[PDB]
């Protein structure tokens, strides 16, 4: 079985926000959505068997609360998806809103916060350039370390 569908939530509101994007361990850059629906706050993907990483930020804008999670999303030979969080942290939303301006933030995490859906809009994977330095495994360690060192706050 080839291409399978995978939908993620992507929406910014006054009171909350849900930013979820996929990252191809293969191409080593964010997967491009084949469709996006503002009418629903979703992004759909036409994935081909392989390994992916799903980044997810969830915010309650009013309580300055922010939930960031890194999750492994593998697609079987015949389209059987199997996930598992590999990282989940609970912190402050204002913390991430700073990372945007920190050149010490890993490329993929910087881009991730950058692409975040604008108000009453969905996120948009820009057919982009560049080539992440490390593999997938190290990439997350760079995210982990950085975010935890940002504890400083």
- Report the C-alpha gap between 145 and 45 in whole angstroms: 29
**Angle at which helices 136-149 and 107-115 cross, to 10°:** 70
For the chain, first and last CA: distance in Å?
A: 48
The answer to whether residue 18 forms part of the interface with a second copy (CB under 8 A) is yes
CB-nearer residue toward a second copy: 2 or 138: 2
Instruction: Kindly state the smallest distance separating residue 21's Cβ from a second copy, in Å.
Output: 13
φ/ψ of 139, rounded to 5, equals -45, -50
Letters for 30-69 (x = contact with a second copy by CB under 8 A, - = none) are --xxxxx-xxxxx---x-x-------x-x-x--x-x-x--
Q: Pick the closer one to a second copy by CB: 33 or 106.
A: 33
Dist. CA 87–CA 64, nearest whole Å? 20
Q: Give the number of residues in contact with a second copy, rule: CB under 8 A.
A: 34
d(CA 38, CA 44): 12
Q: Does 13 bind a second copy (CB under 8 A)?
A: yes
Distance of CA 108 to the CA centre of its chain: 9
Q: Which residues are at the interface with a second copy (CB under 8 A)? A: 1, 3, 6-7, 9, 13, 16, 18, 20, 32-36, 38-42, 46, 48, 56, 58, 60, 63, 65, 67, 81, 83, 90, 120, 124, 126-127
């Amino acid at each position: 079985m080839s291409v399978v569908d995978y939908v993620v939530t992507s929406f910014n509101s006054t009171s909350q926000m849900s930013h979820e994007l996929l990252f191809s361990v293969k191409k080593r850059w964010f997967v491009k959505p084949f469709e996006h629906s503002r009418r629903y706050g979703l992004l759909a993907y036409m994935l081909l068997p392989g390994n992916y990483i799903k980044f997810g930020l969830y915010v309650l804008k009013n309580q300055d609360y922010a939930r960031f999670e890194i999750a492994w999303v593998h697609v079987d030979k015949d389209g059987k998806i199997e996930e598992r969080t590999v990282y989940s942290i609970e912190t402050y939303w204002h913390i991430f809103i700073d990372i945007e301006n920190d050149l010490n933030c890993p490329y993929v995490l910087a881009k991730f916060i950058e692409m975040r859906p604008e108000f009453e809009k969905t996120a948009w994977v820009e057919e982009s350039n560049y080539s992440i330095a490390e593999d997938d495994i190290q990439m997350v360690e760079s995210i982990k370390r950085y975010l935890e060192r940002k504890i400083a706050s």
